[model samples]
Target: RRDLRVMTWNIHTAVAPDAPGVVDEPRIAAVIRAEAPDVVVLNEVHRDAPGPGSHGDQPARLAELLAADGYVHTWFGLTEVDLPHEGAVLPGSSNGNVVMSRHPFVGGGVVVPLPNENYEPGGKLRRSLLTVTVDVPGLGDVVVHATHLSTPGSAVLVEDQKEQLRIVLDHVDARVPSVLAGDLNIWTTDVPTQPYSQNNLMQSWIAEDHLADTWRQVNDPGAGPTMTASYGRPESPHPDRRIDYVFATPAFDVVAGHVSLVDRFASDHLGVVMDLRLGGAPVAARTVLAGEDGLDGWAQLTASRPGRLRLSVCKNRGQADDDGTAVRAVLRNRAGVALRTVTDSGTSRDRCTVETWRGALPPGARLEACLVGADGTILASRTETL
Candidate 1:
């Protein structure tokens, strides 16, 4: 059984009304409720500035009204020097990312080396990824890493994000289910069929590592066109764009979902939602039976086990860029019985699917898969992201 319902949206600083980019708090709340996500991760909401009609602690305020508790809030500052660049210093207004959940969060973290090594003072606005681990009841544990990455053509900035991801993943202690979402500022020439050069953006790894994208996995065909340019019509200098995203790893199953553009709701952009099955609870199999032998009559070891068992096979497929070799997986029971094999065997594909094998296993045996590549060799396994 699944345990948590996760969601993510770029609230656009509660900008809901049509008058002079006026901010509407009520509409913001309504749009959020309409999404009906148990755990909400948002970006661009106001913080500690003094003002009338601002979310004092935008993160907490929304969480309070939504009746969502126990989930911790983490914020990342977009501007460090605090310049009056936006004409006037509005009260309680800040740029960054936020996460609100109904699960218990134990600690907090952030992406580093601010402005990144490539960031310049007068360049595009700065953004950082905010990461944290939380406790979900029916689900054992999970990690939520949110961020609003840099702008277009900022290849260096994108690379900076990748470096940040590497640092964060290196320190992840337990293999808790994790999701990385927010305005990752990614809109490339074409969604690469393979992992992007570490020079573009690190978020690509989730895809590279075979993590699933809710929008794609759900097969929401008509789902294009995100972000509406500040009430500006078609010919307006500002135009609508789609840049926000919700990405999850394998362990978490993404139940069908969609993107809601606040056209009649609140903000200029839409709030994306994913109905996910966070399966972290350990499931026990009633019995584990042995498998038949190979073509020969010889029996094999690893037979009749009660828990999960996996086997990975290397197919020696090359990567898209021809940088590395790809591999495929073959899973079976402890007994010499072959359960199923993964198709699309290759490195560039970075995907796994069932294969044709004239075989069948006893009850309680499921088809599992994994990949082995030229780089960092990960073993055959399962996942928890969504």
Candidate 2:
């Protein structure tokens, strides 16, 4: 049940991507809250000063809007400014990407500037790949790269977009599961009619072999597009054109991918969310049941990882049933002394096995599952160490 859920959204710098002139950080936060993905990659995010249409510290305002959901950690990447640089650009940070997460990040975000040859002057900011790794309980480190490639329009050349993607593909970390997401600003369909088409260039990369596209892995291309195009008419799940994408490397099984219509108008580009597994069969299927614990008592520690704990507990069969309000699921210390009561609502029909998993255990703590009687006496108990 703890499989990782990740999302990528281009917030259009806190402006409504479809409305153009509309600025709504509230809806941007709404999109995040609606989906509630474990990890998020946000494009066109900024911490810059206010200037005319642009508000200062837009990400801070977004954080404020989302403060109710617990403090989300924001790690600034090695991002740079877009368009022309001037004295007015106080913060000097623009056209950047950010990674937000409910889980703790393994480290800070690192920005790797892409090839900028003959492309910085055309109103386009420098492109970059912002990498972040988050530590998920029950799962190891998962790497994420958030980036926005040059559109090949304005001041950026077509070759620049290709080079940036090349650098991203080359530098992606394959050690753990990796997700590359953002606005690629290119087409996936190749046009034989147009020989130098950027679309073909993008297709060539896919043809050669690269990370798995989250959308393509689970759904057919007919599922729909991610770009909320034409500006005026915002499609719930845009039917055509998909420049925004989420790609994953090894050690991931893309269980599901969908265009997040949760807040379609939040940005010009629709958001994409994916449900990912740890690339294998489930750890184990342990459940609270009658058969296993009916004999007398049973307790099993399934698995343990940093900051996470999972175990099964049981009350012995033929034990006097006293609705004890509900059985307590507790974690005890090395000496069999009660340390933490993780939950108090664990109920079992046969007065036996009850599977339970929880978070926040000390690095070196012994996990003891205790099925105590109404009088606070131990009925059935199992202790294990990880």
Candidate 3:
């Protein structure tokens, strides 16, 4: 219910840790820990390969360390697996799209359509996008799509992904929320001129009724040509443009959005995070579910920003959940007033958990508290009037 603090980083195959030439798993791990993303979309992560592997699978290893609920990965390239063992590894698992979430992951896969052109030097090297639909324990289902569209001189490749996107969109439920992001490879400046990237964005816009660009919504000029080609790093920034993005449905209000140039050292492409406030009046209980616990254990996933005023946490409060546990109750008054939440010691999982959150406390809006029984009957109620 609260702002879903999502980060998208292309870790360049975990290359940053070994600056000149050495693997620094710890350093990369530290960066990930610092970010603490609720969900992360990564590209170019090295997986267990054909050789007598010195390095184990990076995605599985990191997932274990983070205690992620589940991870969905897709291999873009089709390379032979370990010969002696004689089993093919997941295609593109060695270096391709990966999406990880703290919440449980539903079904996912690699949707690599046919290659765009016949003239490419590495024509055999097919590209792909990865997708995973997550059932947030408390919140409803959300789709996490990660991809790297073709770079310049590969317009046709991007167009292929556009088609792929359309296919994926068709599979998702219309009412369920979804998010699409990754190294889009479309430099806005060049998108107009570039055939593939231009058509790709065009297709995306047409697919949705209410598309909102996180950057433009936050009034940002651009992430400023983000590419490491000039940075002299292994994951070289693209020679001349910015091709990264974080886009979403209009259901989300831009709470906080920005690009981390410093994090660029972590990869060839800088990472992006968007703090979103789901717009409209707070969703009510009838639309949501009634439970043993009344609005009790929802928390802010991200830190509070300057303009995010009058937010609080409770069970079945802000956004409805899947298992039907917690919700982030929010107040939209611009003046900002303090809100109070209390614990309800009951049989519900929502009651057993703690809800920690922050926001601009506004004056006047009464903090209404309620406790409902299992049969959907009101057990107790309180009102803290300002």
Candidate 4:
């Protein structure tokens, strides 16, 4: 019921691309701290390697700097988990993608390595996807994936990215609300005349209707190019293009989106944010759910004022234990007794599953619809004026 804010940015390895070779973690942290995203995915991040321009243990360091904003959880996805591919790791470099969240992650951080058998010895090395389930209070569990695909060069690079997209989707877990973000390196605004333009954006799964492009949905067509840093030359500002993205599944509606270049000196790419609300419906909810005790819960509305109250409960499919989760949608009294079971029907997903229970209440009734767990626990309760 509350808006879920997600952000994606590539920090260019903690170096200012406009002023390349100058390490600038302060500016990078400043950009994130200013935005105050609930969840953010970052690319070109480095871990434990002691070298120049290194924010050694980068994700944690950024989290620490942004601690005032409650971004404390961090997960790193090292791109080279296996040597099954021809890509070789540089002698001592440890760089990859990162997923940081204000909420606790309750699921997968599996590193699914991208296939790179024919990767050129000189091309950008291996890539991988980091999938995680973040339990946001009053919003339930959402699958947040972080990944950075190979940079574009040849048809080989494009195909390698296509394959990487496939493997990344395998871990997306569509059963729950999901966000796939990071520096994809595949431009959405490039043309034939542009150098390093990718020929694969339309063919990717994230391009599908289900995973809506948040930035494009509410933004001006010509704006929001992420790869816009000067690249160390003020005159030769890198061709403005959009390679960073935030793709959210249809379970949530994008309320607002932004592409911030306020700190262009922070990184080579811009940071994007998407404010989302539950249920991709035409009408917005009158009462947003807040402060639940047991499992974090959600209340999705599909009707308007002076109309019947439409309530739906989307329960987690992945958390079903041997005890069996008995999640239900109901109309209850102020005394907490169910007046009746609201008409309910929904599909259950595999990992981080989602099930829907919906019903229509009488008009102008200050009624309540709630989701209750098997152990007589009220997961979430919402009372709204109709």
Candidate 5:
């Protein structure tokens, strides 16, 4: 299996801590170096037409600085907007998303356009999705898509975000392993009433496309909020919102994921780093049959000795509540006749329970283990030959 460590950050144009107006390019490169990611997806990078002491070409300059840091290839997507610089709008200035990789690109990068309707009149920001392909030595080719969705508030802009997602999904290559990472600008997963708009943006992606939210898979949602409220910005309503994300197709297994808290101050939106391995599902084949509320209560069966078998079960750490859910393990013979049964309840948060069964088996008897839920329904089961 091939392993890749990916990181996504909305750098806020690398603004100075004390002075938001100043863009500190060196500091941005330093934060990225600390993460030591194999590939990075960046948003809110600045570039100017031509000026003194201005960001001549932010994307190219960043690549030059980070080359020593190990990122050799870079791609940028332009989001033309009237950005404020030292309390004034830099008319000809531009900022957008970027994708940098330590691996070589299979082809040139292309920008995916998003809806650009302003809340009021006047000119609004034009969003683009930066899609690039990287050829990994062992993993073959992997597609990397980066974009920042429309900011919330306006009704029209909210609809624009929905359209933007449709276009993004349409553009990505479905055949290869893909990583879509960025400051998605989706504040909540709570889906409101019907006729879905931006409020259901994040939810739609998970439910419709089966794209795994990498951070949500391993970390509890309550504890993994990415937005840093200290650095107040219109884009971020509060600190509890996990707007930034790293989503991957099921073709990639999420080995581990977490919010890079150590570098929280580096940007308004904290960075998310995910360790993914190609060529495996998030869970094992038998594991797919074992389900309890999707994330909790997975059971594994193993032989300990000649007549003894072990069953292990774990609760979801990300579960909001763990109370009276029942878990049962049953041992059966080749004929599907139950030989032994052991049952228990979920005792604690993110806890596991183990049970062992020993029984005499006749000739040609095969052991089968099954896990049952509280409602007398099968959660998951596995048959073993011993």
Candidate 6:
């Protein structure tokens, strides 16, 4: 299976979280480069003139900085920002959303304006969703959507977010695999209600649409919050909440997901990352094998390139032998022809073996790992296919 890694972050307009009014483009670039995701969905990006305290054309600046890191394509969707006013600006930049991909754009992307009925009395801010489709080599075209919804204060605020959800869902095809991620601004602890709720917009929408919250799907929802209100300025003290999300449709299978909190000062909210399998078929990356003693060992298979595959086999906990156990890993083609094989032994200190094979591997290539005990007894075995 071909894998894809994605990251969704609300960059707080490229400002240093601890120093709210400062713009640090290099730091922002560093934080993103650490993840090295295949695709990035960013909210609260900036657009402004180049200067000491400004990030000139955030999308362009980031694209240029990340070019050295492998993200060559960039797209922006404007949400809202008034003309630049030197002293009156927060972070001295305009606000918007951005989509950056390592892959090429498949078609013309779109910036969709979402309805907002709860706009501030004299507010000039507008909400929008940005969408782009890119061609992933083995997965074909995959759509990515990004947005920042209305912050909750009252029932009307939730209504505004509900409307935003409706508009976002309408833009992308549900049948195709797509990633919709952003700072949704709705608390997970909010009580569910019909039509709209004080802070349950996200939950209600997820339930109704059958969308999988990638982070929640892989990790416990009760984990630490993504947003800490005290870290940044806000009207009310929310303290902590998981308001950001990475939602995927049924077309994609989530292999692993995480919410990293180490860079709390990078932004007010923590970033989310997910590694997903493009298609629906079940392809095990790691598996356990049964043996005479019990579950005797574990085997894993991964691909670094089209024809390059990596294999690792390790003994189960407390597994040992006096002379060591002989282990062999075999690779075969779809037609059941043996392509290659590697053999090793497991000892108390060295229980795992890693190997890489570079060959003209096609789809449906199978890998099998077998274990033979010191007494010539079959101990354990397992197989996986690519």
Q: Among these predicted structures, which one has the highest TM-score?
A: 5
Tell me the lDDT of candidate 2: 0.60
TM-score winner, 5 or 6: 5
Among all windows of 10 consecutive residues in model 4, the one with the lowest summed lDDT is 344-353
At residue 175, give the lDDT of candidate 6. Answer: 60
Score each candidate by Cα lDDT: 0.49, 0.60, 0.47, 0.61, 0.64, 0.66
lDDT per residue for candidate 2 within 1-386, as digits (tens), equals: 44888888877777885566666788888888888888888888766655544545776787788768753777656457633324344444455687888778886888898766757544434678888888887877788888888775633466787778888877675445778888887655332244554554454453223355556545543354666663233342233256778876545556787778876777777788888876532232222211223232333333333333444344322211334532344555555566655323222212122233555544455654445556666665444553
RMSD in angstroms, all models? Answer: 10.4, 18.0, 16.6, 15.3, 8.4, 13.5
Model 3 alpha-carbon miss at residue 374, Å: 63
**10 residues in a row with least lDDT, candidate 3:** 282-291
Model 1 residue 278 lDDT? 61
- For model 5, how does the per-residue alpha-carbon lDDT over 1-386 read when each residue is reduced to its tens digit? 59989999888777744456577777778877887888999988988766543566788878988998778988888876667666677777888899888889988898866766444345565788889889877887889999998875456777777777778877765345898888877644332232343443334343235355666556544455667653333232233367788887656656777777665666677778889887632221122112333333334444423455444444322223344455554556677677665554542222245454664454554443344555767665555544
Q: In model 5, where do residues sit more than 4 Å from their true spots?
A: 50-54, 81-88, 117-125, 191-198, 230-240, 280-386
lDDT of 1 at 308: 30
Candidate 1 lands at a TM-score of 0.61
- Candidate 2, 223: how far from true, in Å? 2.5
- What's the TM-score of each model vs. the native? 0.61, 0.64, 0.56, 0.64, 0.68, 0.65
Model number with the top lDDT: 6
In model 5, the worst 10-residue window by lDDT is 281-290
Model 6 ranges with Cα > 4 A deviation: 50-54, 83-93, 120-125, 189-202, 228-240, 281-386
Tens-digit lDDT string for candidate 4 (163-259): 7777777676544678888887765433346464443343224433245556654553235667654323323223235578888765665678777
Between candidates 1 and 4, the TM-score winner: 4
Question: Across residues 1-386, which tens digit of lDDT does each residue of candidate 1 receive?
Answer: 57456767777677664544565556766766676666677877666566544445566566566664334344443432232425665544656677776666777555442345554545544566677676677776677877765554555655665555565444333235678777755431123332533422343334334344555444321233346443234332122234666766545655666676544456756677778876432232111111111100010111212333322122222323333333333455555354554433332223222222323345644433334345746433432111
Which candidate would rank higher by TM-score, 2 or 3?
Answer: 2
Give candidate 4 misplaced runs (Cα > 4 Å): 51-55, 80-90, 121-125, 194-204, 230-240, 280-386
lDDT of 1: 0.49
Clashes of 1: 11
